[PDB]
């Protein structure tokens, strides 16, 4: 017998081998496992694990988010890299000439980028141009702003968006939610 200090036969807890059955995603994985093993570039390691991520863990990146990213000083000519969808933002009126590498582009997002004179490349094209991830800037979308997460941690005095169908007066705005009816949370 052994006095075990930790749980035995414990799986890693991180993803490898993305859950997706998409062959082209798997093709990108096999390319980036090779890069993450033979290159020593930290960029290739994070791209490899980012390709395993589930859809909610790959929030969309709007071209607004990229334009702000390219406004970092020294970052104007960097290759913007996003593992996921690049979406189009109609709240901006100017887009620079940048290069964006992404898994997916929406029709407006791709049209916005090419009209400004830049490129809309995939991650296999980025690897040819940047095997070590040279001059790249990885863009991640907002992950804690989706609708599901605002119900996480719901409890007394937490302010976390009850799970509710109908919204309005007489839908959970009473006893327990105001001091004029009992108590407040």
């Amino acid at each position: 017998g052994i006095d075990h200090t930790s749980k035995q036969h414990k799986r890693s807890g991180h993803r490898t081998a993305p859950k997706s059955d998409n062959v082209y995603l798997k093709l990108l994985v096999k390319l980036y496992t090779f890069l993450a093993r033979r290159t020593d570039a930290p960029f290739n390691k994070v791209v490899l694990k980012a390709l395993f991520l589930s859809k909610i863990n790959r929030p969309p990146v709007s071209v607004s988010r990229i334009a702000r990213a390219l406004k970092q000083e020294g970052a104007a000519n960097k290759t913007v890299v996003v593992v996921g969808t690049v979406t189009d933002d109609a709240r901006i009126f100017e887009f620079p000439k940048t290069t964006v590498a992404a898994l997916r582009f929406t029709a407006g997002a791709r049209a916005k980028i090419v009209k400004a004179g830049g490129e809309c490349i995939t991650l296999d094209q980025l690897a040819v141009r940047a095997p070590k991830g040279q001059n790249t800037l990885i863009l991640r979308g907002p992950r804690n702003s989706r609708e599901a997460v605002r119900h996480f941690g719901m409890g007394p005095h937490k302010g976390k968006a009850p799970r509710i169908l109908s919204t309005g007066r007489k839908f959970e705005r009473a006893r327990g939610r105001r001091r004029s009816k009992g108590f407040k949370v």
């Binding site: 017998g1 052994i2 006095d3 075990h4 200090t5």
Partner: protein, 222 residues
Amino acid sequence: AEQVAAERAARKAANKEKRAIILERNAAYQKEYETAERNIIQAKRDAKAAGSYYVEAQHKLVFVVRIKGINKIPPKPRKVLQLLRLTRINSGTFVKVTKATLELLKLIEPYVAYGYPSYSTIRQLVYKRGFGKINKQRVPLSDNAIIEANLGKYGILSIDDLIHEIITVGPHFKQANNFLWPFKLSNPSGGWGVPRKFKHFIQGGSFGNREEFINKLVKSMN
């Protein structure tokens, strides 16, 4: 890239140089070992000559071996056995003797036998059952390169360099001792010498501090 003699010659020459200094260092350790034991003997003779009593230094190293199984152990000694890396019966580790570690030993006294190992048993422990913790893996020492690749930053280059850092508790004892995987000993070849293990050694049992008699117990377990 013809590569028949040029590359292998340099590597063998580098290996030969590492052997010469390992040989030089092992000769120095033997001289230091022999000097210390004689000097203790000479001091005892001199104190006897001048009508006085020579009190030997308190032993600086203990080897502790867990002699109890893993069932029915109260939480505090169970935590101490884990921090001493004794998670199996007959598992043994070296412990640098200090008040911080001595109080640890008194807590786990009913579950272990320990004492003061000599150079002979440490050499035999490391040679026979010596495994290094490398990448969280238990790899047999079996080669000077394996210690030099993991403890060379502390100047420990050979198996004897590792043994030296254990027998004479050195500045890098903690790194050298933790590098060693907990020793996995057998049951004693001739038995425990007592009918019942789970009394103190003083009471005719087996657990607790047997000062020098750990050498006989360990050598028969190793």
